[PDB]
Every structure is written in C-alpha cells, then in structure tokens.
Design a protein around this ligand. Structure first.
Ligand SMILES: Nc1nc2c(ncn2[C@@H]2O[C@H](COP(=O)(O)O[C@@H]3[C@H](O)[C@@H](CO)O[C@H]3n3cnc4c(=O)[nH]c(N)nc43)[C@@H](O)[C@H]2O)c(=O)[nH]1
Length: 245
C-alpha cells in the first residue's frame, strides 16, 4: 500500500539511507566499540549488490515543525522527538528494543530483515527508525518499511547498484560512481546523493539519496530526486569495501 503521512505531512523530501554494510561491521572494527548478533552471519551471498542494505527513510523537516522554531540541525538530531513539536519520546540508539514494537506484518518483517541485518531479534533497528522518523507521521509501518525495501531494491538493480557490485573491493572515483548513477537517472540528479566514508584511504560506508516526497510511491525515475548540497566525506576516490573485517 502507499506511504502517506497522517500528520506533519508538510515536508518536501525523504532521505533514503543505505548502508554499505560491509563497512557497517568494518566501522566498529576501525573505531572498535561494539559488535552485534547480525554480522555474525558472514554469509558470502552471490550478488555483491546485496551488501547494500536499508538503514532508513527519513522525512525532511515538516513546515509546521519549522514554523515553531525548529531548524535542520535539531530536526536531524531528534526527528519525531524534536521540541516543542512533534515531541514524541526520544528513541535511544543504545537500546533500540525499548522503542515501541512497530506492529509490522510477518511478511513485511521477513522481507525487511533480509535487507536490514539490524531489524528484529535483539537489535530492533526498525523500532528505533520508526520511532525517530515514522511514528509522528502516523505512517503505516508496512507501507513504510515495504517502501524502503522496494527503493533499496531499485537502487541495487540500477547502474549505481551494478557499479558497486562490479567494483567490489576496488578503488573507484566519485566521477565514475556519478556516471553510473547518471546512466540510470541522468546527470541532473547526481547531486541527490551523499556518500559517507570512513578511514584514510576512504572506504564507502553509506549512501543517502534525497527523493521528492510526492514521488515516494512511484518507481524511481528521472523526476524522483532532489539535488542537495552535500556530496559527502569520501573525496575524489574511495574503496568499495569488501567483507571480512
Ligand atoms: N536514524 C538516524 N538518523 C540520524 C542520526 N544522526 C543523524 N541522523 C540523520 O541523518 C540525516 C542526513 O545524513 P547526515 O548528512 O546527517 O550524516 C552525517 C554527515 O555525514 C556528517 C555531517 O556532515 O555527519 C553525520 N552524522 C551521523 N550521525 C551523526 C550524529 O549522531 N551526530 C552528528 N553531529 N553528525 C552525525 C538527517 O536527516 C538526520 O535525521 C541517528 O542517530 N539515527
């Protein structure tokens, strides 16, 4: 079913946040902080594109929220928990399992956990994500998580996804990554993407893509994206990190 905000629907974009998950378990081997009952699978799949996983679908700052003195920084920091509104309880990145159960269908939770290692179990990434980015909007949990799953699959299947798979383990240029993205969605949309990296040399850890809120329920196309001002912190060339940290 279609994703629709029941309140605070007055925002212009969603940010699709994808993890290059190979650096979602290598990152906590670089800084060394915590490991989770997820990267333990170590399942060398077949399609290298599948190391691109769903992190989140983050609505931008609603106009009715901004009107009450909330800025981008605050919205980014707290989402649904921003003050004075929407002022829902702050979700805790530590104990994601203490956020409300999202009430998603068993079909949805299955499809979700295949592309979101941190979903369910003793991790509950999806509870945290829904609490910070979805509950205040009243999004149907099944449409919300089904939508991010679909979008991730569209990215993985695009020339950007193929690019990641073909260059698995390799050092690529931002120029060539951009050209792959452009092959599917056009050069005018290359700026909808922010890449995050860690390390020096830089290795890819996250891909965030800004999507027009009114295009969220359609397959991605030339008209789906919103260019944004941050290319990210990867620099000119970076590594498409392999698994085996
Ligand atoms: N789900 C989730 N979203 C977050 C979190 N922290 C920030 N965000 C979000 O990320 C979005 C945009 O992505 P970013 O550009 O902020 O990713 C960051 C960017 O790479 C760089 C800024 O140029 O630092 C990063 N960055 C990532 N996490 C953090 C953080 O906890 N604090 C700060 N100060 N910065 C953070 C926002 O819409 C916002 O909701 C979080 O803990 N969980």
């Amino acid at each position: 079913l279609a994703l629709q905000a029941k309140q605070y629907g007055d925002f212009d974009r969603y940010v699709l946040a994808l993890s290059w998950q190979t650096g979602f378990c290598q990152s906590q081997h670089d800084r060394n902080r915590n490991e989770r009952d997820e990267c333990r699978l170590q399942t060398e799949t077949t399609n290298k594109a599948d190391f691109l996983t769903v992190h989140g679908l983050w609505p931008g700052l609603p106009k009715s929220v901004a009107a009450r003195g909330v800025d981008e920084r605050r919205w980014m920091r707290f989402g649904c928990a921003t003050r004075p509104i929407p002022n829902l309880p702050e979700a805790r990145a530590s104990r994601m399992c203490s956020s409300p159960e999202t009430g998603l269908s068993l079909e949805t939770a299955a499809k979700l956990s295949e592309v979101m290692p941190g979903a369910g179990g003793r991790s509950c990434l999806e509870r945290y994500e829904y609490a910070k980015h979805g509950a205040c909007f009243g999004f149907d949990p099944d449409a919300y998580f089904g939508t991010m799953v679909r979008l991730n699959q569209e990215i993985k299947e695009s020339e950007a996804g193929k690019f990641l798979a073909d260059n698995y383990g390799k050092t690529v240029s931002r120029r060539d990554f951009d050209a792959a993205f452009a092959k599917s969605w056009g050069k005018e949309n290359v700026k909808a993407v922010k890449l995050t990296c860690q390390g020096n040399p830089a290795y890819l850890t996250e891909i965030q893509i800004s999507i027009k809120a009114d295009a969220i329920n359609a397959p991605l196309s030339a008209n789906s994206f919103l260019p944004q001002p941050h290319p990210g912190n990867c620099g000119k060339t970076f590594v498409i990190d392999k698994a085996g940290y």
